Design a protein around this motif. Structure first.
Motif, PDB file in Angstrom:
ATOM      1  N   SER A   1      57.316  15.924  64.232  1.00  0.00           N
ATOM      2  CA  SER A   1      58.043  15.923  65.491  1.00  0.00           C
ATOM      3  C   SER A   1      57.263  15.145  66.543  1.00  0.00           C
ATOM      4  O   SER A   1      56.039  15.009  66.467  1.00  0.00           O
ATOM      5  CB  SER A   1      58.302  17.352  65.987  1.00  0.00           C
ATOM      6  N   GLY A   2      57.992  14.636  67.534  1.00  0.00           N
ATOM      7  CA  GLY A   2      57.401  13.870  68.609  1.00  0.00           C
ATOM      8  C   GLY A   2      57.260  12.388  68.344  1.00  0.00           C
ATOM      9  O   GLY A   2      56.834  11.653  69.245  1.00  0.00           O
ATOM     10  N   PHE A   3      57.604  11.923  67.145  1.00  0.00           N
ATOM     11  CA  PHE A   3      57.490  10.513  66.801  1.00  0.00           C
ATOM     12  C   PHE A   3      58.341  10.245  65.569  1.00  0.00           C
ATOM     13  O   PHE A   3      58.816  11.167  64.902  1.00  0.00           O
ATOM     14  CB  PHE A   3      56.034  10.111  66.550  1.00  0.00           C
ATOM     15  N   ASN A   4      58.522   8.962  65.272  1.00  0.00           N
ATOM     16  CA  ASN A   4      59.249   8.523  64.089  1.00  0.00           C
ATOM     17  C   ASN A   4      58.254   8.204  62.981  1.00  0.00           C
ATOM     18  O   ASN A   4      57.309   7.435  63.192  1.00  0.00           O
ATOM     19  CB  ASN A   4      60.111   7.298  64.400  1.00  0.00           C
ATOM     20  N   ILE A   5      58.467   8.798  61.804  1.00  0.00           N
ATOM     21  CA  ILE A   5      57.547   8.577  60.692  1.00  0.00           C
ATOM     22  C   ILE A   5      57.614   7.136  60.209  1.00  0.00           C
ATOM     23  O   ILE A   5      56.643   6.619  59.643  1.00  0.00           O
ATOM     24  CB  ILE A   5      57.835   9.567  59.547  1.00  0.00           C
TER      25      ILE A   5
END
Lengths: 20, 192, 219
Positions: C25-29
């Protein structure tokens, strides 16, 4: 994609940011 | 496979003094990376690119080295640093870690207090001793179990031991005296 | 604020398969890689492998290939780690992290919370439980309970639900040669306050759902 996730291939990429 | 032999694995240091720990490799690498892991918590990254601190790392920490010579040094040690400081490289695949050096606090020399519990398995207790080295010997009727040691307590930097002598109910009623003998560090004699 | 939501603890049979999760969560993998690390208990860290979330760039430790299988869901933003033929050596705690390569200075910036895995065949064993003149020392008397013969870890042990905070030592459990776990939890009281103030050890074993309240009475 080794040239971006390895150590020795960082001083090389540091030269691309000062020559672009 | 470039592996990291880290040293000194076990060490002790009080507050104020400097602390330097190395992590040498089997082959020359270009950068070293440091990770601190407190007990029961995920490893927090410390130093990246040989000598670049992370966001929450105090400026007293610092790294240095070149090739296989790679280390981490602390200007003046504080209290909330006692943990394991695993190292890692990114120069060759597979990526390997070091076994980490366990950091402990240097408390004053203090012997423990012995206590025994009787089964109504005999449990012996050692409380608040520094350093952590201890020797427990059970003596049932003067005749010669599993140990358990807590981490360095956050209040006094002392350890505590628990030896659990297991014995069946048939052999428990066959003997009489059940003792627990301990030999400490500062004490030049044993107890029971 | 960046977090990696992993899965919960597992208990598998010797030789079965098990899959772990890591919801980032909090970013795009897709803007980074995803690495898994195995840490044998009381030992060091072992790099498992990685996967490129956007496409096939999956690497593993050559000594870890075949056993590990790392997948990813681009739309779910969750990385998975599948294992097979679980053995006693595989009994360890597994983590989850990322690496942005050169642009992220390589170092594992944000880690997951860690997932504990256990492998055995003696499953769901409830815990068994167990102050005299030889337990006191200088106005301070030692007393406690013995949580024995339970599986799997852990067993929460509290005293009077908040009382006797100081002087509490819940020792880490030992792996007996019988296959079951057994720890201790002692607490120090005063000279004659052991019989006056009632003390009780609240042993709660969540896996087997065994909540046991044992009262420690003086000899």
């Amino acid at each position: 994609k080794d040239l971006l996730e390895l150590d020795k291939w960082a001083s090389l990429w540091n030269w691309f940011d000062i020559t672009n | 496979q470039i592996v990291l032999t880290q040293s000194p694995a076990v060490m002790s240091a009080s507050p104020g003094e400097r602390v330097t720990m190395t992590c040498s490799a089997s082959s020359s690498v270009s950068y070293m990376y440091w990770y601190q892991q407190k007990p029961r918590s995920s490893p927090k990254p410390w130093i990246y690119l040989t000598s670049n601190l992370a966001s929450g790392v105090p400026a007293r920490f610092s790294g240095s080295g070149s090739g296989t010579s790679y280390s981490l040094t602390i200007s003046s040690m504080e209290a909330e640093d006692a943990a394991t400081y695993y190292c890692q490289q990114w120069s060759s695949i597979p990526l390997t870690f070091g076994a980490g050096t366990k950091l402990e606090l240097k408390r004053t020399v203090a012997a423990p207090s012995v206590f025994i519990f009787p089964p109504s398995s005999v449990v012996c207790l050692l409380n608040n001793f520094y350093p952590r080295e201890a020797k427990v010997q059970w003596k049932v009727d003067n005749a010669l179990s599993q140990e358990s040691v807590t981490e360095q307590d956050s209040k006094d930097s002392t350890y505590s031991l628990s030896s659990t002598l297991t014995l069946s109910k048939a052999d428990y009623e066959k003997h009489k005296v059940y003792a627990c003998e301990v030999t400490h560090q500062g004490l030049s004699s044993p107890v029971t | 604020e960046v977090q990696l939501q992993q899965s919960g603890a597992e208990l598998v049979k010797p030789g079965a398969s098990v899959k772990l999760s890591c919801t980032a969560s909090g970013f795009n993998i897709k803007d980074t890689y995803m690495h898994w690390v195995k840490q044998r208990p009381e030992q060091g860290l072992e790099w498992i492998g990685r996967i490129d979330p956007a496409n096939g760039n999956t690497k593993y430790d050559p000594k870890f290939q075949g056993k590990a299988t790392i997948t990813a869901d681009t739309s779910s933003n969750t990385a998975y780690l599948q294992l097979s033929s679980l053995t006693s050596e595989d009994t360890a705690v597994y983590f989850c992290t990322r690496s942005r390569g050169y642009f992220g200075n390589y170092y594992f910036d944000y880690w997951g919370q860690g997932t504990t895995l256990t492998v055995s065949s003696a499953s769901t064993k409830g815990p068994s439980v167990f102050p005299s003149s030889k337990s006191t020392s200088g106005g301070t008397a030692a007393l406690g309970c013995l949580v024995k013969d339970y599986f799997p870890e852990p067993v929460t042990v509290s005293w009077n639900s908040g009382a006797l905070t100081s002087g509490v030592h819940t020792f880490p459990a030992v792996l007996q040669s019988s296959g079951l776990y057994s720890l201790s939890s002692v607490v120090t009281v005063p000279s004659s306050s052991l019989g006056t103030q009632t003390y009780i050890c609240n042993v709660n074993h969540k896996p087997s759902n065994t909540k046991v309240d044992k009262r420690v009475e003086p000899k």
